[model samples]
Target: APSYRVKRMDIAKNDEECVVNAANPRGLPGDGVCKAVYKKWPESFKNSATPVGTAKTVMCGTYPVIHAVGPNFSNYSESEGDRELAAAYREVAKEVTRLGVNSVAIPLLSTGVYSGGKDRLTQSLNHLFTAMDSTDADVVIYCRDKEWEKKISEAIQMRT
Candidate 1:
C-alpha cells in the first residue's frame, strides 16, 4: 500500500527524487523553506516555480524540485486555506507522477513562517494525505522544527 512517512530533517538535505516547497502564489522563493531553496539552487528554483496550486519541476543536483504553493494562513479563510493546501499536495503528487518519480519529500504545508497554527497545519495535512493517498508514491513529510515534529508525531499516532 502507498504510505506517507514523517521525519525530522532539513528539507534541503532531503534524499527523495522530488522535494516540495511551501511556496507563495506568485512562486516567490523568498523566505522560510523557499529561502533555503533559493540559496541552494537560485536560478533553477526561480525557473521552476509556477503559479500557486500548480507544480513545477526543476533539476537541482540529482533530484527534481517540486515547487508547491501552499496557502498563506493569514490571507485566507480557514476553508480556503485548507483547499489550497490540499491542491498543493495533489499537484505535487501529480507532477511527480508525470515525471515518473516514485518518492517525494514535503514540509508540512503552510505551517511554519506562513503562520498556520498547529490546528490548521494538522487539518491541512489530513486533507493532503487524503488527496494523495490514492496515488502510488511514498510521501515523506519533513518536520524541520522541533515543535512541528512533535505535533506531526502526535498527529500520526492519533490517526485511525
Candidate 2:
C-alpha cells in the first residue's frame, strides 16, 4: 500500500527519502536545501529546477544524478505549456519508482522556475501522488522553507 507523510525537517536528517533544495547539479551542496539533503543520503535523487550538466549522471556527494530539466529558471508560462510540466512531474514520478525507491520526496516542481499556476501544480502533483500510491512506496513532499510548505500543503489539501 502507498503511504503519505509530511515533515518540515532539518537538512541534516538522513532518513528522508529526498530533500528539497534550491540548488542544482551545477551548484555545490548545502548551497541548496535539496543538494544538502542529497549530500548525506547519497541515494536521494536531485530534482533540478533548472537543467544542468550534459551527462544524465552527475555526482551529488557519492551518488549519481538523473539530471534536471532546466536552462530556464522561469518555467514555461501558462499559455506556453502547463500540461508539459504535469507530464514532467509524471515522468519524474515514474522514474523514481523505477529507480526502486519506496518513497519519493519532492518539492513544488515548476512552481519555482516554470511559473506554473497553483492549480496546475496541484492537479499534476495529485495525479502523480495518486499514481505513486499504487506502488508499495510512499510519496513524501518535503518543504525546507515554511512558505513553500504552506503552498504545497494548500495544493495537496485542494487535491481532495
Candidate 3:
C-alpha cells in the first residue's frame, strides 16, 4: 500500500514527480484548479484526450502530468459512476507505476465541475484509497478547502 498526504493547496504547487489533473475528455481546461494546471502546462497538450475511466500522461513544463478523466455523476447510476471513478484513479496509479514516478499529487476527480454529490465524493475517496493502495509512490491528495479536507483527512486516518 502507498502512503498518502492531504493538503489545503493547489495541486500544481506540490513538489512531486508528477501531478494528477481532473481532466476533460474533450481536452478542455476546466475552472479553478484545472485552469491553473492548464495555464502552467505547455500549450502542447491541446490535442490530447483521456476519456472517462482512463488516464494518460504528458509533459507539463519540467515535470509530467497524469490526466485522469472521471465520470460525470448525472450520466450514470450511482454504482456505475462509482466504478468509472475508481477506474480513473486506478488508471492513474497504474500509469505512475509504469512510469516509475516516485511521488504524485492528486485531486478528487469529478467532484467539482462534474456534479458529484456527497455520496459520490465518499465513493470517490474510498475508490481512491483502494486504487492507489498497490502503488509504491508517495501520494499527496490536494484539497482546496476545509470542508473537503475534513473528509479526506478522515479517510486518511482510517486507511493509512
**How well is each residue in 1-160 modelled by candidate 1, as lDDT tens digits?**
5567788888888877778777676656667888877777665555664765566777766667778887777877777767777787788778877877778888767776766454456676786677667678787788767776787778776763
lDDT of 2 by residue, 1-160 (tens): 6666555665355354433333353533433444554555554444343443111333456333434332222444554444544444555555565566655555544444333324334554564565455556666765466765676677656653
| Residue 75 alpha-carbon offset, candidate 1, angstroms | 1.6
Best by TM-score: 3
Residue pairs whose backbone atoms clash in candidate 3: none
| lDDT score at residue 58, model 3, on the 0-100 scale | 82
Off by over 4 Å in 2: 10-14, 17-75, 113-124, 130-134, 147-160
Q: Candidate 1: where are CA atoms >4 Å away?
A: 116-119, 157-160
lDDT of the candidates, in the order given: 0.73, 0.47, 0.80
Candidate 3: segments with Cα more than 4 A from true spot: 116-119
What overall lDDT, based on C-alpha atoms, would model 1 receive against the true structure? 0.73
Candidate 2 accuracy as lDDT: 0.47
TM-score per candidate: 0.84, 0.56, 0.90
lDDT by residue for model 3 (20-121), tens: 888878778887567878887746265658788999888756577888888888676778877888899999989889889889998888687675554455
